[PDB]
């Protein structure tokens, strides 16, 4: 099974460097081009950088060419985009991405991204409130924080059945805030046990909330 | 650049029926007889995955109600019937000359029997009144369509500027969409008021349904 896991995004200045990491398994990694594709907060797919299987020929967009530099490790399997003189618009999802062998006219497998944010804001972790109860509704709180993403899961992955966690909004003070909520039946309340488990990465945040 | 334009940008097909998305390119991705857009799915906390390459040839592993067409600069998307799991947002994507460029997305919607939300309200919790700020949180669940009207009303008085709204993305099983909405106040002004209701008015709703709690 092919698999690529990018590591190493977060938090940064303008005007700052940062080096992203994406770890190949399950195939050949010197036998394929590469590229480095981000997916802005709008939505949108940007392709940022390629290197070929041969010469260590790289190719960027205007966009970031000068700033960006990929690179490979082939005995290592890894991959890497090394980013300097960073701008707010290059805050994004970076996915590290395969191209189709041969033709390699096509994206054959993707990583689950690493997200950087390029800003002179603070991190910020979040504070996690009760949302406290046919069907009985229930949830957390996720308030305040800064930046972009926070994970969530209930009673440690064994809960996800009527689980919905919110995307988050933007407060006007700059920081986000979502609930995430799960229906269950209104007798289990008394014997069940119910914890919302929240990861804030970019400020080090691990919470567990009884409900 | 070889800009690529999508339309429409969003589109709602309902169950059965036939899906038709479009992608302009600036100029012709032809070569030497094949013409290189490729289509993307992608769905919510997921990367994209391709399901056409090379305007019309389907990826192992897609199903058949997926295909594409076109050439030069005029290509299409075809689904056909459309199932509930193919809301999705969709990407057409050029790989004939560098830089690699994508169009901005199509966002699918499946359209399905209209289905009330079950409506919960929340008070805040003591913990958070002590840092002085009291958020209360309204839950619409699994409803169809989207349209809904959240109103808060405060000792029967209704709010406006204090509330925000999030909703989930259309369910893969059932088409169905989740809504909170946040009403946030100051502490002093939260122990101003006895009567907390969140009235909601939907398609599927035989009249508002209000969900309410006394401080
Ligand atoms: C592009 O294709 C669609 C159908 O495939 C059609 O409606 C449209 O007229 C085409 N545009 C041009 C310029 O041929």
């Known amino acids: 099974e092919v698999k690529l896991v990018e590591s190493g995004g977060g938090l940064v200045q303008p005007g700052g460097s940062l080096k992203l990491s994406c770890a190949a398994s399950g195939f050949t990694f010197s036998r394929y081009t590469m590229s480095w594709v981000r997916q802005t907060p709008e939505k949108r797919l940007e392709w940022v950088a390629k290197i070929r299987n041969v010469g260590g020929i790289t190719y960027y967009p205007d966009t970031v060419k000068g700033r960006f530099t990929i690179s490979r490790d082939n005995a290592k399997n890894t991959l890497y985009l090394q980013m300097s003189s960073l701008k707010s618009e290059d805050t994004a999802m970076y996915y590290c991405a395969r191209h189709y062998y041969g033709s390699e006219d096509y994206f054959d497998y993707w990583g689950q991204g690493t997200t950087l944010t390029v800003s002179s804001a603070s991190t910020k972790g979040p504070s996690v409130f009760p949302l406290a109860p046919g069907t009985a509704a229930l949830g957390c709180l996720v308030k305040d924080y800064f930046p972009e993403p926070v994970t969530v899961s209930w009673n440690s992955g064994a809960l996800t059945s009527g689980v919905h966690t919110f995307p988050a909004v933007l407060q006007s003070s700059g920081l986000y805030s979502l609930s995430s909520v799960v229906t269950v039946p209104s007798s289990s309340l008394g014997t069940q046990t119910y914890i919302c488990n929240v990861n804030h990465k970019p400020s080090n945040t691990k919470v567990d909330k009884k409900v | 650049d070889n800009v690529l334009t999508q339309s429409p940008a969003s589109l709602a097909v309902s169950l059965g029926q036939r899906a038709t998305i479009s992608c302009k390119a600036s100029?012709?991705?032809?070569?030497?007889?094949?013409?290189?857009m490729n289509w993307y799915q992608q769905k919510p906390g997921q990367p994209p995955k391709v399901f056409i390459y090379?305007?019309?040839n389907l990826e192992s592993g897609i199903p058949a109600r997926f295909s594409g067409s076109g050439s030069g600069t005029n290509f299409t998307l075809n689904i056909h019937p459309v199932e509930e799991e193919d809301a999705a947002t969709y990407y057409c994507?050029?790989?004939?000359?560098?830089?690699?460029?994508f169009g901005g997305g199509t966002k699918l919607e499946i359209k399905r029997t209209v289905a009330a939300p079950s409506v919960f309200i929340f008070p805040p919790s003591d913990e958070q009144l002590k840092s002085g700020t009291a958020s209360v949180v309204c839950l619409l669940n699994n409803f169809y369509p989207r349209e809904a009207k959240v109103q808060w009303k405060v000792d029967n008085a209704l709010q406006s500027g204090n509330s925000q709204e999030s909703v989930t993305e259309q369910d893969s099983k059932d088409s169905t969409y989740s809504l909170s909405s946040t009403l946030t106040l100051s502490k002093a002004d939260y122990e101003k008021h006895k009567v907390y209701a969140c009235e909601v008015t939907h398609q599927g709703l035989s009249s508002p349904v209000t969900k309410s709690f006394n401080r």
């Open positions: 100029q012709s991705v032809d070569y030497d007889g094949d013409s290189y």
């Open positions: 090379a305007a019309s």
């Open positions: 994507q050029q790989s004939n000359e560098d830089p690699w460029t």
